[PDB]
Amino acid sequence: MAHSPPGHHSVTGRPSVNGLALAEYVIYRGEQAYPEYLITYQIMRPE
Amino acid sequence: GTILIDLSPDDKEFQSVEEEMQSTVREHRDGGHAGGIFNRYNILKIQKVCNKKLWERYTHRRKEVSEENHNHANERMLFHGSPFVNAIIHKGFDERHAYIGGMFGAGIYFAENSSKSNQYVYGIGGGTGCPVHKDRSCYICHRQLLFCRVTLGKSFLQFSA
Numbered sequence: 001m002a003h004s005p006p007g008h009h010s011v012t013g014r015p016s017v018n019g020l021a022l023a024e025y026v027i028y029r030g031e032q033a034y035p036e037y038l039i040t041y042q043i044m045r046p047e
Numbered sequence: 048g049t050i051l052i053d054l055s056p057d058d059k060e061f062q063s064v065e066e067e068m069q070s071t072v073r074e075h076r077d078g079g080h081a082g083g084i085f086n087r088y089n090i091l092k093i094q095k096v097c098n099k100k101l102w103e104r105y106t107h108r109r110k111e112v113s114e115e116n117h118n119h120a121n122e123r124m125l126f127h128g129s130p131f132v133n134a135i136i137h138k139g140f141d142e143r144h145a146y147i148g149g150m151f152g153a154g155i156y157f158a159e160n161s162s163k164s165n166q167y168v169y170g171i172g173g174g175t176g177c178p179v180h181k182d183r184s185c186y187i188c189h190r191q192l193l194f195c196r197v198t199l200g201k202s203f204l205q206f207s208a
């Protein structure tokens with residue numbers, strides 16, 4: 001795993017082209033996330 | 048150490064998680080290549096993930112981050128899609144779950160858009176799709192995502208395409 005940029009705990013990827021996209025985020029230590037819900041699903045064929 | 052507790056569809060907690068999942072679907076620039084073609088999901092099950100050791104590890108680190116950032120953990124709830132979802136719920140996130148080739152470096156990646164994480168359930172780029180039909184847009188096979196509590200602390204803002 002890489003290191004966080006110095007003085008930061010994560011990176012935020014702010015989309016600057018696709019106006020409909022929300023943010024993506026990167027952490028560099030496993031201890032900074034807890035997997036709280038497991039969701040089981042299918043994608044649905046559009047009609 | 049991990050136990051999984053099923054939520055009832057009647058429970059407000061099931062409903063709030065479902066709503067976050069459905070309401071954050073978007074269209075993707077690959078036309079559905081990685082994650083398939085869809086506007087919404089059929090949610091089959093939502094389970095709460097309970098592991099005391101992994102929780103205490105998370106809250107320990109959260110307090111350290113908070114103390115380094117004016118008592119602000121900057122905690123978010125975000126999606127993670129991965130072929131390693133079973134390992135993650137039993138042993139926690141670590142370096143094995145990093146996206147070595149990700150655009151912001153080798154770290155663990157999370158999305159606000161559920162449909163973004165959906166693109167990684169069968170691997171990077173959607174891999175070869177579902178194990179049974181080798182279809183990235185399979186409408187039959189059961190998929191799994193995680194909805195995770197993530198401490199961001201002071202986050203480096205990267206503007207990007």
Ligand SMILES: O=c1cc(-c2ccc(-c3nnn[nH]3)cc2)oc2ccccc12
Nearest residue numbers: 024127128129146156157158164167171
């Ligand atoms: O949910 C995500 C999972 C992952 C991800 C990436 C690589 C892997 C991986 N590494 N090797 N196989 N799969 C697993 C999950 O990447 C993302 C990138 C952007 C936004 C969200 C995600």
Ligand SMILES: [Zn+2]
Nearest residue numbers: 177180185188
């Ligand atoms: Zn399938």
